[PDB]
Subunit: 152 residues, 6 copies
């Protein structure tokens, strides 16, 4: 029986950090579902994220109208949530979310991987602020996502 992980996010944008963690968890799980919780209509973000993840066969992308993460995993048979931790702040934020999800769905297990060094300082909020003032963050974004994003 499959070990299935949901990797939830708003992926606004998907960064090479997300890709990195996705790549690594595809090795750890039978499958990984990227739940994009809904600049781009759902099926544009879906397009980009499938484009970006195309070379990984056990990885699928699903739009999810906003709801309880654990409800979305239950309805997909995902008994695992997979999250990254990049710093102390991230640790405590993720940890509160995991204790809450454990109360809500005790049979679902949150699993953590640490962010890799080139990406540990990268969050979409700082990315977006830098995108907004024109800075070159092209090293932090999958190329499809960078090219799609010039239409600003």
């Amino acid at each position: 029986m499959r070990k299935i992980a949901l990797f939830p996010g708003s992926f606004d944008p998907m960064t090479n950090g997300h890709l990195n963690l996705i790549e690594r968890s595809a090795k750890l799980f039978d499958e990984v579902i990227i739940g994009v919780f809904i600049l781009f209509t759902p099926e544009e973000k879906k397009y980009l994220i499938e484009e970006a993840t195309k070379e990984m066969p056990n990885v699928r992308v699903i739009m999810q109208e906003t709801q309880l993460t654990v409800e979305s995993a239950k309805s997909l048979g995902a008994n695992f949530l997979i999250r990254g931790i990049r710093n102390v702040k991230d640790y405590e934020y993720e940890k509160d979310i995991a204790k809450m999800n454990q109360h809500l769905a005790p049979e679902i297990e949150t699993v953590f991987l640490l962010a890799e060094e080139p990406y540990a300082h990268v969050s979409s909020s700082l990315l977006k602020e830098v995108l907004r003032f024109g800075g070159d963050v092209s090293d932090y974004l999958p190329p499809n996502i960078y090219h799609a994003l010039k239409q600003k």
Copy 2:
């Protein structure tokens, strides 16, 4: 003489973690005043909080117009501020508030209790997020506050 503590807060909603701090507080001070700094009306929160804290003879609810916490404790003869710490983030935030409060009113002592480990992950903002999607957090709310909540 009486040692009186003010326990300031929003209590939006009051949680079982708030209640646990109040119960532990009530063994430490002669009186605890729950100061509700102002969903519901003033009169409503007042009743609800009173209802939840009714088993505790030395605890009372005094609704407060938004002002400096120290000005409010001064006006009640509360020479102690009582607060909870549940994590490092909360630790550094309460810390800054205590030092500001000490510069404002050096005769007033801030006292801290650590959250009990069942509630150490509970924030009013996370609890509200779960409630809005219909998750069951009834075990983190006073029964009467859980009812008044469903009811609205």
Copy 3:
């Protein structure tokens, strides 16, 4: 991959926390090896762990001469290491170990689980302090390791 994990440790003593993390990880991996790195002889240590972990079919105990954890994982065919994080201190210390281990053996993934609430304050060092002053920490140790510790 196929999914075998080494859970390294000194297990002096093994706690209910260790046990908890073993149980959760036996659900994620095909096999999990408990690597006890070296007042019991190792053989006594090995028997006690096995005895505590016996109801778990995909769990194996192995004694290891003190060596590089990654080399030990390589011998056993473990392509994962599994670790617990109980607090910020533990987070930064595991993180340095995981980054080093990944410099040494980049094909091995370190995967993390958060300590659950009852055991988040429990370390073997605090536990040994209590044990040495006669404190009752029997709720924190598996029953056979507690009875065994009494006879010693």
Copy 4:
């Protein structure tokens, strides 16, 4: 590198903690440029900081329309950014900004000074809260800035 530092921030208001970091900065660099990024008009803000820092011949003030800090530093010929760290939250936040700025302009160094401990708890967020309820925070503000805050 030339010893020319940019000290960026919004200085609304400028505090004694800002002034202290500027004072210690002026002992370290040949030139320190205070970069004000934009109730107090910018023409006013410039004047107050100029006034507050008049005693330091190697310090000057420039208002910057908001842009990437590395680009403002480039334009002014600064090869150093100086920042202050007042707590763990402030450290992890500045570290991210620093690592991003190094990605954008790896030839600019970020240099850090710790807050002097009388101002380690002071942030404009907190200060402004206290001011607006009329608490006396006069000790945290250069007199010129304070005397000008009153006529609002």
Copy 5:
């Protein structure tokens, strides 16, 4: 509960940070016991700490053989434990001790004060290093403990 608190410690040396927390505690509790857990003589330590605290009438010093703190409290009739927190590492360490103590003796409450910022960086281990090298840390020690120290 009766407002009787144990402030435990090795007090080697006792600092002005320790005095500061004792002064603050003596405003809250009917009785504050300084539990000195046992090179000055035990007899010497007792006199030294007694002379430092003499200005406070609801304080008393008791030497104690090393043992579980909650057993010492229970013997002396203390219902509260008073500790100080000076930083994040101190916070996580005291938190673990408090939870363990809560397990051993749930009727005893641990109460926390935050170090006054002048003493936030002062730890006996740091202090002892400086003393060993002859640095002047007279500001950080009750003058009587300092005079006594110059002797030995």
Copy 6:
């Protein structure tokens, strides 16, 4: 004040982390002293570190016997101490040192640089623990130091 900095350490071994901070500080100060506070004799250490830093005309290497860092600074004519911060543990530990040093020698300024992220997880204790089990941490040492080390 004169741009003369002491970079204090035991440099056992000096790592590429250290070398990175000396290279960046060599851009900021007129003179950087590597202060080596005392496997290798002092003069062996001296020649290894001089050889590792020889391409910087404004760097020099001075052995010191263990003593208060700030009087070492004062003896050598340094006005600044330069340190690196790699993580939260390290930030709290350096902060206390810097605050004590400021007490002892208020005219000496401590200045911080953040660890560059390939070495952010590298410490003396962890490097030596790996070296003693045979691991290849050659990317982490100046090549001359690593060679000299493989001969002992």
